[PDB]
Each structure stands twice: as structure tokens, then as C-alpha cells.
Amino acid sequence: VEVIAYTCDQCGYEVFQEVNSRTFTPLSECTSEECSQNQTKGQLFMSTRASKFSAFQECKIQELSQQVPVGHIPRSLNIHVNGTLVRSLSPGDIVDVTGIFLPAPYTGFKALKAGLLTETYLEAQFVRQHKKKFASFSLTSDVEERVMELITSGDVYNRLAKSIAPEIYGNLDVKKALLLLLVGGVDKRVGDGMKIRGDINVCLMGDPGVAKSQLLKAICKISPRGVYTTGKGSSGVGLTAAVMKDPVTDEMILEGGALVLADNGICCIDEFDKMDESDRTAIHEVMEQQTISISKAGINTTLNARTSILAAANPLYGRYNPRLSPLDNINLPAALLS
Amino acid sequence: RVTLQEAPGTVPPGRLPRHREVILLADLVDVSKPGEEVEVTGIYKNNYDGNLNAKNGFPVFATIIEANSIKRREGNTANEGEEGLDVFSWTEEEERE
Amino acid sequence: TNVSIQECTTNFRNFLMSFKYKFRKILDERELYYIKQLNEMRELGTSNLNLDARNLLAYKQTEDLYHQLLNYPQEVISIMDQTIKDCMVSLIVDLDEIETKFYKVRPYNVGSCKGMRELNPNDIDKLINLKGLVLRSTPVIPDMKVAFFKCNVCDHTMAVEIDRGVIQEPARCERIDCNEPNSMSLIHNRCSFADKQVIKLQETPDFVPDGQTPHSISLCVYDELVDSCRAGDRIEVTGTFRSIPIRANSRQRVLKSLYKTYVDVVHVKKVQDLAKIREVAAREDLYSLLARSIAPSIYELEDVKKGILLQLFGGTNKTFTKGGRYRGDINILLCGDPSTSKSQILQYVHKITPRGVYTSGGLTAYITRDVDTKQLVLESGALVLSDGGVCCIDEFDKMSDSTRSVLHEVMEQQTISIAKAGIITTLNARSSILASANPIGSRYNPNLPVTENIDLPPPLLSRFDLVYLVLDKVDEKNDRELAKHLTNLYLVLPVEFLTMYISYAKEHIHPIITEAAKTELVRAYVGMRKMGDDSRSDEKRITATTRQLESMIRLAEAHAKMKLKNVVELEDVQEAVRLIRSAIKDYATDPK
Amino acid sequence: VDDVTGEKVREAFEQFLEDFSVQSTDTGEVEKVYRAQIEFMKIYDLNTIYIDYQHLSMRENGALAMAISEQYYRFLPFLQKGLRRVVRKYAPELLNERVFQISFFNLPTVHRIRDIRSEKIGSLLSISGTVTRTSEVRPELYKASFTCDMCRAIVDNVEQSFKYTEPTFCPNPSCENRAFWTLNVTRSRFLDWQKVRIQENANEIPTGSMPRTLDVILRGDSVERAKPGDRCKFTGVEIVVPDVTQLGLPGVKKTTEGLNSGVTGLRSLGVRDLTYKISFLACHVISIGDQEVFLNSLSSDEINELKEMVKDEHIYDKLVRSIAPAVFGHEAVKKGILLQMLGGVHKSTVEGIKLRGDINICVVGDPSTSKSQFLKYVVGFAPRSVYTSGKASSAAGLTAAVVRDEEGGDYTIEAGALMLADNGICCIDEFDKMDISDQVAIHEAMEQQTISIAKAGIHATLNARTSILAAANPVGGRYNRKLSLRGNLNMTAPIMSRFDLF
DNA sequence: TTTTTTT
DNA sequence: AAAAAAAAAAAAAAAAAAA
Numbered sequence A: 001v002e003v004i005a006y007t008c009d010q011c012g013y014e015v016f017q018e019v020n021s022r023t024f025t026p027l028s029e030c031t032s033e034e035c036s037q038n039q040t041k042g043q044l045f046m047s048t049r050a051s052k053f054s055a056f057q058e059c060k061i062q063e064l065s066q067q068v069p070v071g072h073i074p075r076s077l078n079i080h081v082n083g084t085l086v087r088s089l090s091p092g093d094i095v096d097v098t099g100i101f102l103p104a105p106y107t108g109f110k111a112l113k114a115g116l117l118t119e120t121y122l123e124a125q126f127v128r129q130h131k132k133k134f135a136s137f138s139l140t141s142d143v144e145e146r147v148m149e150l151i152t153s154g155d156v157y158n159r160l161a162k163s164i165a166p167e168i169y170g171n172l173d174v175k176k177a178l179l180l181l182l183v184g185g186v187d188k189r190v191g192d193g194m195k196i197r198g199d200i201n202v203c204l205m206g207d208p209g210v211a212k213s214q215l216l217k218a219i220c221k222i223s224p225r226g227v228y229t230t231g232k233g234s235s236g237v238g239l240t241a242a243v244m245k246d247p248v249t250d251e252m253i254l255e256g257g258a259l260v261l262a263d264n265g266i267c268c269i270d271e272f273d274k275m276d277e278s279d280r281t282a283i284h285e286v287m288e289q290q291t292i293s294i295s296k297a298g299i300n301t302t303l304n305a306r307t308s309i310l311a312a313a314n315p316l317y318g319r320y321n322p323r324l325s326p327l328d329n330i331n332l333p334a335a336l337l338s
Numbered sequence B: 001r002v003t004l005q006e007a008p009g010t011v012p013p014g015r016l017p018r019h020r021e022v023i024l025l026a027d028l029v030d031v032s033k034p035g036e037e038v039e040v041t042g043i044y045k046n047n048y049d050g051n052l053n054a055k056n057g058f059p060v061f062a063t064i065i066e067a068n069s070i071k072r073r074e075g076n077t078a079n080e081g082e083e084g085l086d087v088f089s090w091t092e093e094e095e096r097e
Numbered sequence C: 001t002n003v004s005i006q007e008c009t010t011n012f013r014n015f016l017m018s019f020k021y022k023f024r025k026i027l028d029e030r031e032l033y034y035i036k037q038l039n040e041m042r043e044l045g046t047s048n049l050n051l052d053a054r055n056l057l058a059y060k061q062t063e064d065l066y067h068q069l070l071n072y073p074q075e076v077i078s079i080m081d082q083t084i085k086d087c088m089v090s091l092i093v094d095l096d097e098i099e100t101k102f103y104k105v106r107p108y109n110v111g112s113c114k115g116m117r118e119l120n121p122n123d124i125d126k127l128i129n130l131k132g133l134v135l136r137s138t139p140v141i142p143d144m145k146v147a148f149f150k151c152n153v154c155d156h157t158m159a160v161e162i163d164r165g166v167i168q169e170p171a172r173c174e175r176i177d178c179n180e181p182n183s184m185s186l187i188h189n190r191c192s193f194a195d196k197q198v199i200k201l202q203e204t205p206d207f208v209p210d211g212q213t214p215h216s217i218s219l220c221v222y223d224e225l226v227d228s229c230r231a232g233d234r235i236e237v238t239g240t241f242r243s244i245p246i247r248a249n250s251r252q253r254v255l256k257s258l259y260k261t262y263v264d265v266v267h268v269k270k271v272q273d274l275a276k277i278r279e280v281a282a283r284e285d286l287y288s289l290l291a292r293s294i295a296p297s298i299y300e301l302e303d304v305k306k307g308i309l310l311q312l313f314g315g316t317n318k319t320f321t322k323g324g325r326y327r328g329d330i331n332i333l334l335c336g337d338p339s340t341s342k343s344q345i346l347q348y349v350h351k352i353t354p355r356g357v358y359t360s361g362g363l364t365a366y367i368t369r370d371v372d373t374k375q376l377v378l379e380s381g382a383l384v385l386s387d388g389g390v391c392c393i394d395e396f397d398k399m400s401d402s403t404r405s406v407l408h409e410v411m412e413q414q415t416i417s418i419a420k421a422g423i424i425t426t427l428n429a430r431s432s433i434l435a436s437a438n439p440i441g442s443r444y445n446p447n448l449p450v451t452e453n454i455d456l457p458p459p460l461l462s463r464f465d466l467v468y469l470v471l472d473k474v475d476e477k478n479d480r481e482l483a484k485h486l487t488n489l490y491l492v493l494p495v496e497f498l499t500m501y502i503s504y505a506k507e508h509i510h511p512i513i514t515e516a517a518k519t520e521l522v523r524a525y526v527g528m529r530k531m532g533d534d535s536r537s538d539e540k541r542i543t544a545t546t547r548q549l550e551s552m553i554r555l556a557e558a559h560a561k562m563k564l565k566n567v568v569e570l571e572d573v574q575e576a577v578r579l580i581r582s583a584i585k586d587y588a589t590d591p592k
Numbered sequence D: 001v002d003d004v005t006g007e008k009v010r011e012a013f014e015q016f017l018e019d020f021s022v023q024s025t026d027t028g029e030v031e032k033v034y035r036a037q038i039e040f041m042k043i044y045d046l047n048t049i050y051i052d053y054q055h056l057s058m059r060e061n062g063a064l065a066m067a068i069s070e071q072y073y074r075f076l077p078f079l080q081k082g083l084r085r086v087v088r089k090y091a092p093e094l095l096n097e098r099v100f101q102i103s104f105f106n107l108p109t110v111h112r113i114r115d116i117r118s119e120k121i122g123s124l125l126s127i128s129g130t131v132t133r134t135s136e137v138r139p140e141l142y143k144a145s146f147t148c149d150m151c152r153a154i155v156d157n158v159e160q161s162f163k164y165t166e167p168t169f170c171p172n173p174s175c176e177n178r179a180f181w182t183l184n185v186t187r188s189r190f191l192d193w194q195k196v197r198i199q200e201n202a203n204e205i206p207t208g209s210m211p212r213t214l215d216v217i218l219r220g221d222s223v224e225r226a227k228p229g230d231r232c233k234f235t236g237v238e239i240v241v242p243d244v245t246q247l248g249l250p251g252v253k254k255t256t257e258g259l260n261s262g263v264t265g266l267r268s269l270g271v272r273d274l275t276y277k278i279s280f281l282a283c284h285v286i287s288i289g290d291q292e293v294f295l296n297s298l299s300s301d302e303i304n305e306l307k308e309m310v311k312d313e314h315i316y317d318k319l320v321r322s323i324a325p326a327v328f329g330h331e332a333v334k335k336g337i338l339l340q341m342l343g344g345v346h347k348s349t350v351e352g353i354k355l356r357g358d359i360n361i362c363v364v365g366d367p368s369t370s371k372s373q374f375l376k377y378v379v380g381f382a383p384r385s386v387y388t389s390g391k392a393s394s395a396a397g398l399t400a401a402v403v404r405d406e407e408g409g410d411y412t413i414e415a416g417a418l419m420l421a422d423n424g425i426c427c428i429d430e431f432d433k434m435d436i437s438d439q440v441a442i443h444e445a446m447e448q449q450t451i452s453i454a455k456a457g458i459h460a461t462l463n464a465r466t467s468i469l470a471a472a473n474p475v476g477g478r479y480n481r482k483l484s485l486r487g488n489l490n491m492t493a494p495i496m497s498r499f500d501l502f
Numbered sequence E: 001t002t003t004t005t006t007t
Numbered sequence F: 001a002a003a004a005a006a007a008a009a010a011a012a013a014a015a016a017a018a019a
């Protein structure tokens, strides 16, 4: 709200008032002469149409790791944004914000303490989005001449394989398989609506100290949709949406059965023999572009799971074995292996 | 004051017990111990409450039991040999015999 | 504004009597809707007028009223309803049904469907079109309309109208004989109320391309729109926007600087053929085509398809009191290596069946604590909801152990009881079971008997009605045909007609067996008894069990269930016995 | 002001109470069924009349039946006044002043929970559902007597509402009701009260939508007539209840979204908003799911049939043939089951030692021969029978168990299957599979005919007066004729001596 | 069958 | 007039699992 307009059952002029504080009180009796009379000429009510409003939003920012002094915990800062600049920034990006550093009264808490202590906030004025733009390969003259140069380059795939992770020596065919994973397989269905997916499921297997995790990190860096997971450390990785019990009002916002950006994502997993039965059930359910339809409270908004699976696992002995491999295996179901 | 449930051997199977409050005046203090089955003779009385009327929307009243006599009935369920608050107590002629 | 009261009503009435959808047809470049529909309403007794905007836009004078309607929805709609109220008499010239019924309109297709991610405050008090998924609901909330009062000293009663919720209470009773000011007391239970329901709506996932989270917009409905939607629905709505001050501290007069956003909707949309059956039902080869019509993409595997179809048809259920009811459901198990697309069959049958729940190895009733509210509700599991239909189970080997007993409880009595938290009751299931399981290892060894590879207890697998085994072995020919079929598909089928036919057979048709079939049944039983023994003293296992007789009785009844017959024939029993013995013929272990 | 409509409906109501004069049979020329009900009250001191809606249906047609049914709340006190008039006309001493009640039954239709709408508020209605929770029987104030302190000026027969109300004036002219009023407990009249919760049955609910829940308020003689898990049909008047917290009280004062259809502008409310919610009030509840004492139940058939079958001379000969006609063969098993149903005499010594007086039977056989049929038949016939499997997924096992919510004191016990079977005949199926702890509990429990488990700082003694009937299976599929029961069955030696027959 | 460990 | 509660740590009983 910026200006609040009332109406008093045909009192000529209709009273206007303005409020800048985050709280206010309404009017009850108007000052018109017919109501300056001992009794009111019709009771007044708040009018929504005549009043003025502005778009409002609230965001908070966190310090970068590089700027945190050793042995310290990063702090936060709130930002209030108004006007057309609303919706000019999204979570998870580096920005350079210029604004006005204003105080905020503590009386909203209504604790009667902190006689001199008050909170602080920032009001945005001009935002530089910074970071990088994906642009969805939008065509332009420069990218057209770039692809012309690529065509003139002749043979491409070998150079692309060589250029992924020069830090890790050798392993050419793994990089070739990575190339073939990045493009995707046959897709867009067949006759009679039968389901086929272009996603490719490739599992990396080998001894510790082979830098398969580092190659996986390089692939995650080089891909835009890549998501990296590993053995334990948190419980929100799967089976629960990121908005579980998130709002300050605790609205139980959720989708039900879903994973992390599983729609056209690249699920990179390390220590594929480490996770519990719940994550294993989830990854059996994400099979062959099958959606995730796990319900807990009547929710059935399934997530359209269509992702390529790339996971690295280590042998339970930590080394290869002279005896048969399928019995040694990875302690994984044969159905999942197939 | 103490909380009195129903005897688990008395409640119908698969049901839930009903709690009551018992107030013990002078000379009855600490006669009862936690976890034991007891039988109490008392007076039933009612009193007004605010939150009880708040949570129900009807003029409901609370009730407490003012204890007047307490008899222990743990283990020894054979309750027909003799009467009295304590069956392990003796008179003087019983001591003489 | 005060412009549309006079001329817009008359113009709309004129085009009510003057509209012909031929104008819209010309606009299409590939008839008096209002009067014919209004007389239809007159002869129906209904009270509803759907109203599209495009055909409303088709006329040049009406678009002015169109724009005025977007700006001022409430007043325009009210005056349109009054116009229809007068059009009642203007057209009938019984007038008795008219005075009793109200009139309302349902505008729709007013504009482009927006999303919750772009809602600027410029769109306040404006009509919008929204699509989304209904998440939750709320109990109907009474709304105050007519306040009742009673002058308690003099028992005098007065009825008071209200406006904008706030009541102007009478400061004194009208009876000047008492004329007391303080004798005004209201009666809660003698008033009149309106039914209000609040719905929570989620944006469609189409509006979130980059893995963000959807949002929620509150909804409000009145009267005929109450309970018109429930959880999981996909609907589209058309209604105006609204904003409200939030109370903040309920003990204080202050109000917060922000307002809650919610919408009020007025219209919601979602997202004798029995002769044809007999013409189809009269054909001789209905059985084979009907069986092959439910799995178009599955190559060969005809016998299992026939068995599954007969299971879908079901047997007969009877409740004679002298000996208690008899189970009429068929249960079939699937086993084999995971190279057969066997989950596809369950997926087919789940959507083909009228009622059914598809799950995998919690399945039954268990009391839960409510999440959004703090209360206790009794919740029923998947098996309870599959009453009369087919319950499909996958990964049956990974069944844990506690749940298995529950199945042993339900397959032998079709009734489940619960004794928890002071609740003791019994629930009916009466459902069919279809399950698939995998062997242990990279392959199923034919020499190895079935029992160990399927790691189920002998009683549970013995008490299934039938069982089927799939064994993929490498051959040049069969692999050639499979590869050709798969390539051709990669490179005669009915419609929901199937569902209605199944229902009609299920509940209209009650076939019974005849005296002639008894002789064939007993002869078959004696025969397999003899086939289960030999002249030698090996003491052969008794392979002809009473379960076989019950199974064949149910299967013969099922064969008469299809083709809409009323009494079984011999062909039914020969088909049933051949089907029941084909699986047994491949049930043997490495010996013999 | 006089509501002449109420007077007219009261007159018609008392009139058809007076002279309904319906005949039930040919021998019953004129019966005056309601006079007979009043006679029953005279001879038994009862309080509540029961009125069939169909008998009320044809009386003055819709001029009376619909008038009473629709505005039931409006005309209830008029019906009460007419009832008092007639009863004191015919039975004055019966009033020795007391709260008569009226329960209507046999309504032409029943409504589902999802069909409840506000337009039927104040109208008689019938609903059905499953009760999932009850509340303790608490008393409530009905008619109060207040004293105006300094001058007592007894203000009696003060009515109440959802809020604890007080008198507003002092009839003493010298007094001016300035002194605050004080309630007289011994002069007030209380009534019973119990709140229950219901929910839709599984058949009505479409899809996986969550059930709709409603609250039902009982009063009078209908207390404790419903138990959790019982599907019951109620009859009563639909009402609406406000939030008393916003209303003035001597005490001190999904959901965050608000948007409640409130109302304000009143004197007592002040700056507060009053909300409403739906509740049901009930008046009638039904559920849809010594030898001299027995002889006192006299009837012609009761006399003749029993006299004949006692004076008969092949009773036993026929009797065993009359048990479980569905099963074929197994003649001795039927006699055994009959003896099990008959039971044995229970005697207790003069030392407080209990002697077992029941029979326990085990049945063994090769698979798929009729053995489950006997258990199913006896469960379907014998009263207070419980059917269960040897292996149970419940935490209660067979005997009992203790259950707690986390950080919840006293570890409230849960009744086991055997505990439910107590005070009645039990049935066990698939007996060979058993829990070892439950097995060592039961074999000492059968002799003691009781089980006592003490765990987690709580202890109790339970009653398990049960007759056990169990079925087992020979090890190896089929009974090997060479060996014996000990060789064929793996079940332990001491339990075999617990059973009395095989 | 027994003791251990996890829920 | 009201801060009241999610996050931890520690103590059991039941069931299932391995030897």
C-alpha cells in the first residue's frame, strides 16, 4: 500500500491518507461537514480500487566464501525491492547491488526490549546481474561464423574428447563415451505412443585413485544441467522437494515424489554403493524415463523424470579380483546393472 | 493430588482408560505409591473451569474426587476373607490368641 | 461507473434476441442460440447460463460491454442476471417457477490464461482465466446472511439484513411498550447462512522450466461450485482478482502494510450402445481378437494373455448362508527373467481395468496423524481401495516379511481387521491379485525347480489360483522374429467400449453352471488323479487337489461370463481344464 | 408475543399423541401405543419417548410432519410443553420437574457427510459414518439458580447457551442487581454430555481424496452408545457453533490464511471478529455394523421346542449331525467341536487357587483338506470368537505389548489377540509358526489362564480366560504314517500336554 | 537356537 | 502481555538378523 482511499456513502470528497511505515491504523469517521454534524452521513469503508499499490518483494544475500575470514561463519543481509525492478534477480547468482542502507524499527517484534537496538536493511536501486548468460544458443552472426569455423575444422569429436579434461592423462574412450552421452540417444517416441528415451545410462567402475571423480567433476563443470551427488552428508538430496517446510508460515509446500532437477538433468553420482535403500529405490524408480509418483499426504503431482544417469562406484574390495566379477560385482542388483 | 487411571485388568479389551484426579487431605499423605492398584472411597464433587468451557463451546464442568479412605489391592486379589482397610492388621485379642 | 445501466442492458437484450452463430462461422472462414437455449431452460427447470466471450466479441456493439465487463465484473454480471430475470416474462408471453429461481451466468474464455509467476497489481479487480491443479480443500464454512434478533424481555423478534459483513445492531427493541435498549439478544440457530468453500490451487508444472518451485493461490467458491472439485484434479477457472487487509494482532486495530492475494471464481471447467455389443458379441472369434486386443505391442505369449483376460472378466460371487460366502476372484502369478517387459502387462491392465491400484513392494490400512491439521484419521491402504477390481503388485520377491502375512490374511478370507489405538473393526477387500517376481541370479535354470528361484514360502505360492512361467532361451529363429518385430514396431483395437463391456458383463450377467458340465468336471478330476499316479510304488504326490476343482469351477464360470451367456457349455470346461493343465505341464522340475 | 403456529403444532402433536389409536394385529383392536409407552414409564421410571417418523408422517400430512421436521429447533419447546401437558394430565407422579426427551427415528432417507450444506440448519436429519474417537462423560449445566449476593433474590430457571450466562436484573425493588451473582450448585440441574467424531466410509469416498470429518454431540441417555470403529447411523438436528473465545468469558483468551466468513460490529465483540463452524447434534443412535433368567424369556416356541429337544431320546444322535453341514466327512471332529463349545465347569478352591475349566483342541492334517473350514465356521458361529494367524504383523503379537509415542510416559499397553479373545472362545490358525517369546508366554499362560508382562517401568496382570482351538501341519508336507506326533511335529513337548485332545 | 543391533 | 519451539542427546523395547 502507498495511498489508502475510503468512501463514506456519498460524502462528496472521499478521504485520502498515506502510510509509509510497515503498519498503520484505519479511519472510522470522515471530516466532511455533513459528518462534521453530530452524526455521520453513512459509515465509511476502505476502497481497494481507488487506493494505490506498488509491487514489493524481499530477498536476502549471503557473503562469498572468499571474503570470509578464517574461523568465521558467513553473515546475511536483507534487501527490499520496489517498483519495476522487482523480479530482476533469481536465487543462486553473484550480483553487485547498489542501494540505501536504512534502519528498521524493532517494534514489529513487539518485545518491548532492545530500547536502543534496531535492525537494518537495504533498499535496492540498481542491480548488475553479472555471472553468465546461457542464452539458449540464440543465433547470432558471431555464433554462426563460429559454427562455420567448426565445420571447416573437419573432424571434431576427437578434439572435443581431448579438450575435456587434459589434467587427467589418457582414458580416451571414456571421453568418447562422455561425448556420446552429452548428445543424447534416440527420442521423441514411436508409433502407438510407445515410450523411448534419448537418455543414456553409463556407469563408471574402477579402482580408487583413478581420478574418475575428477573427470566427473569436469563433466559437471562443462555441462549446464549437471547435478553432482555422493555418499551421504545430507538427507535432502532425494525423495523430498527443496521447499519442504520452507515458508515462514510453514505452508507444507511440496510436490511429492521428485528429485533434483530430474527433467533433462544429468545425475552425476559418486560412491554408487554407499547410499541407503531410499535413494536406491528412487534411482530404480527414475528408470527409463519413468516418473516419480511417491505419495505421503494425498499429493500425486509426479515429476516427469527424464534424465541421463552417470555414476561412479568403487569395488567393495577396493581392487580388482582374480575370481569371477559378477559375484564380486558392486553389491548392486543384477536388474539395475542390466 | 494424584492421577487415577483404570485398572488394566478391568478395562474392556482394546479400549482406552479414563483418568480422574484425586485430592488427598491431611493424614492421607503419601499413603499411595506410583504404579500400584488401589481402591478409594471418596466424595464426588464438581467445579467450574474456564478453558474447559473454551475448548468445547458448552457449559461443561470439571470433577475431582476428595479422598476419604484408601485401601491397597496390589497382588492380593482374594478380597473375601475379611473386611476392613487393612487385612494384615490385628486387634489386641488376635495378638492374645 | 454509471454508464452501463441504461443502454448496455438494452443492447445486450437486443443481441440476445438477435444473435446467430453464423456470424462466428463467418469469422471462422471454414442459429439463435439464446432464445432456443432459454426456452430449453424454461422446459428444463434448470438455472444456469453459460456465456462465451469470443461469440460475444463477434458483435460490434457488444465489445463495448465486453470491455466494460472486464473493468466492472460484479455490476455487469448482476445487471445481466436481472436482464435474464426479466427475459423470463418477456419470452413466456407459467410465471410460478420463475419467481422461485434465481439466475446467474458463467462467463468464460474472456482472455489468455495467465500464470502465478506474472501477476502485477495492475490486475486487481479484473477478470482472468487460470489453469492449474487442485491440491487440497476445506470443509464448507457457513456465511452470515440474515441476522436474527429477539427482544428477550418482550420475546419480540426482528430480522435484520447485513452488508459487507458488518452488522448494524439495533440499539433498542422496536416495541415502544417496553422500548428497552439493552434487551437485544440474537439467536445463532434461527438465522440463514450461505455455503463457502476455499480451494488451494497449484500452477501447472509447464510454467516452471528451470527446476524452480511452484506456488499456490487461494480460491473461493459459492453454492453450485461447492465440492465441484477435489484433490488431484486438473481444472481451468475464470474469475476476478482480489486483495484483502490482514488482521495482524487480533487484539489490536492495526493492519499490516501488505495484503493477501486471492481470487474469486464464477466458472470452472476440467482440463443405447448395448445393441452394438451384441453384434460384436455374436461373432465366433470374439475370444481371440478380444484377448490379443489388450496387448498390441506384445509379441506372441498368447496363452498368458488369454489367462489375464479371463482373470479380468472374473468369476461369480455367491453368499449362500448355509455355508458362508465363496470367493469369486482369480489370482495369477508371473515369473521369469527381467527380459520380457512383464511390467508393461501390469501397466496395461491397470488402466484397462475399471478399478485398480498399481503398487510395488503400507499396502493396507494404518492410522495416520494429519499433516496440515492436527487430528487423527483412519486411512485405508491400496488393497482396500481395489474392491471388485484388480490389484497389481510388482517386485513381489522384495516383499519384506511383515506384509506377507497380511496377504495370507486377505487371500483366504477377503477381509482385514485392525486393532490399534482403541479402534477395532473389519474391512472388506474382495479383490483380485496379479503379481510378478524375478528369479535369483542372472538367469533361471530350467533344471532348478521353481521354488528356490522365486524365494516365496510354499503355502503362499500354493494358494495362488494359477501361475505362469516365462523362460527366454537363445535360438536363431525366435531371436530373428523378435528382432524383426521390435524393429518394425520401432520403425482391430477397441476403445473404452472395453470398459463398459466389462462392467456390463460384471454386473448384468450372472452365469451358472449346468448338470452336464458336472460330469466333465468330475471326469477331468478323476483323470488328473490317475495322471498323478502310476502302477509303481513310488507313492506319487497327490497333484489333483481341491484347489484345482475350485479353480476350474471359477474358470468355467468366467468363460461363461464373457460372450454374455447365462449357462456354461462344454467348450467352457474344456478350455478351462486345458488352461489349468498347460501351466502344470511346464511346472515339472528336472526329474521327469 | 404468541407464536400461534407453535401453539397449533403443539395442539396437533399432543392430539395425535392422545389418540393415535393404531392397531398392530387383529387381536390388537385398539392399542394406543404411546399410552403403553407412558405405562412403561410409570412402571419403570423412564424419561425419553421414542417416536417413529412414519407414524408421524400421515398425521395431518405435510401440515404437521414437514412443519415439525424442517423447523425442529423452532418448535422443540412447544413439543416439550405439549408432552408435559399430556403426561401431567395422565401421570402427575411421573414428573416427580424432570427432563423429558423425545427421540425421532425411521426417517425416509439418510445423507452422506459430503452432502451437508448450510441450508438444512435447524432441520431434523439422519447421517451415517464410522466413529473414530469419543470423549469422557462430563456433566454440563442446564438450568441454573443464581443468588444476587447482598439480597439473595433467587434467580432460578436461568437458561444457558454456548457461553456461561448470568442474570441481568434483580427482582427485589430495594436491590438493584449491583452485587455480582453467585451460582448455587446444589440447586442447579446438570445433564450428561459427550463429544464424538465421525468420518466418511471407504465406499463413499472417490479417488484418494482425504475423508471429510464432522463432530457429533450427544446428550441424555445416548451416552456411550457408540464405540470406535463402529459404523453407526445417527438422528438429530443440524446446528452451527461459534468461537466462544471471541465472545466474552470470565477466563482469559491452513489456519494462518484466515479469510474466514466472519462478522463484527456488536457490543460484546468490540474489535473482534466472530467465526462459525459446523457441528451436529444427535438424539438417537443405531449401529449398522441363571437358567431361571433364560426361562423368564417366555414364548410358545421357547417352551415347546426346548421341551421337545430335552424330552427327546436321540438328541446327541442328531446333535453332532447338525454341526457344520458344509463340511463332508470327519465325524469325530464335529463331536470334538461340539464338546469344545459346551465347555467345562469352572471351580475355585477355598484357598484362592483357580482350576482350569475349559477344553483346548489341536487339529493336524495334510494340506487342503477342510481344516480351515472348521475354524471359519466356528468363528462365524461362536459368539465372541476371534480368528487370527500364527504369525501376526502386529506389534501386539498374540498375548500383548506396550506402545508409546516417543517421549510419552507410562507405555500404555495394547491388547493382544488373545487378550481380545478373553472372556470368550478363541480360534488360532496356522499354529505351527509361532513367536518364541510368545510361545514361552502362552504355554505358561494356558495353565495360569492369565498372562502378565512387566516392562519399561510398568506392570499389570491381565485376564486371558480363553478356549484355544488350533490347526497345525505335519513337517514335510504330509503326515508320515511310520512316526508319531512327536516325530512328525516340531512343536515342543510341554505344549502338547497343554492341549487336551488331538 | 541364541545374541546382537537397529528402529 | 507472553517467548513455546526445531534441533539435538540419551534411554529403552521390539524385531530381525547372523552365527
Ligand SMILES: Nc1ncnc2c1ncn2[C@@H]1O[C@H](COP(=O)(O)OP(=O)(O)OP(=O)(O)O)[C@@H](O)[C@H]1O
Pocket: A167, A168, A169, A170, A207, A208, A209, A210, A211, A212, A213, A214, A312, A314
Ligand atoms: N590419469 C590421471 N591423471 C592425472 N591425475 C590423476 C590420474 N589418475 C589419478 N590422478 C590423481 O589422483 C587423484 C584423484 O583420484 P581419486 O582417488 O580422488 O579418484 P577416484 O578414483 O574417483 O577415487 P576416490 O573415491 O578415492 O576419490 C588426484 O590427485 C589426481 O591428480
Ligand SMILES: Nc1ncnc2c1ncn2[C@@H]1O[C@H](COP(=O)(O)OP(=O)(O)O)[C@@H](O)[C@H]1O
Pocket: A335, C297, C298, C299, C337, C338, C339, C340, C341, C342, C343, C344, C436, C438
Ligand atoms: N517381448 C518384448 N517386447 C517388447 N519389449 C521387450 C520385450 N521383452 C523385453 N522388452 C524390453 O525389455 C525390458 C524388460 O523389462 P522387464 O522384464 O519388465 O523388467 P522388470 O520386470 O524386472 O522390471 C522392457 O522394458 C522392454 O522395453
Ligand SMILES: Nc1ncnc2c1ncn2[C@@H]1O[C@H](COP(=O)(O)OP(=O)(O)O)[C@@H](O)[C@H]1O
Pocket: C546, C547, C550, D326, D327, D328, D329, D366, D367, D368, D369, D370, D371, D372, D373
Ligand atoms: N466339504 C468339504 N470337504 C472336504 N474339503 C473341503 C470341503 N469344503 C472345502 N474343502 C477344502 O478344504 C480346504 C480348507 O483349507 P485348508 O485345509 O486349510 O487348506 P490349506 O491346508 O492349504 O490351508 C479348502 O481349500 C477347500 O478347498
Ligand SMILES: [Mg+2]
Pocket: A208, A209, A212, A213, A270
Ligand atoms: Mg573417487
Ligand SMILES: [Zn+2]
Pocket: A007, A008, A009, A010, A011, A030, A035, A040, A041, A042, A043, A044
Ligand atoms: Zn459518510
Ligand SMILES: [Zn+2]
Pocket: C151, C154, C156, C173, C174, C175, C176, C178, C179, C180, C183
Ligand atoms: Zn421490545
Ligand SMILES: [Zn+2]
Pocket: D148, D149, D150, D151, D152, D153, D170, D175, D176, D177, D178, D179
Ligand atoms: Zn442483590
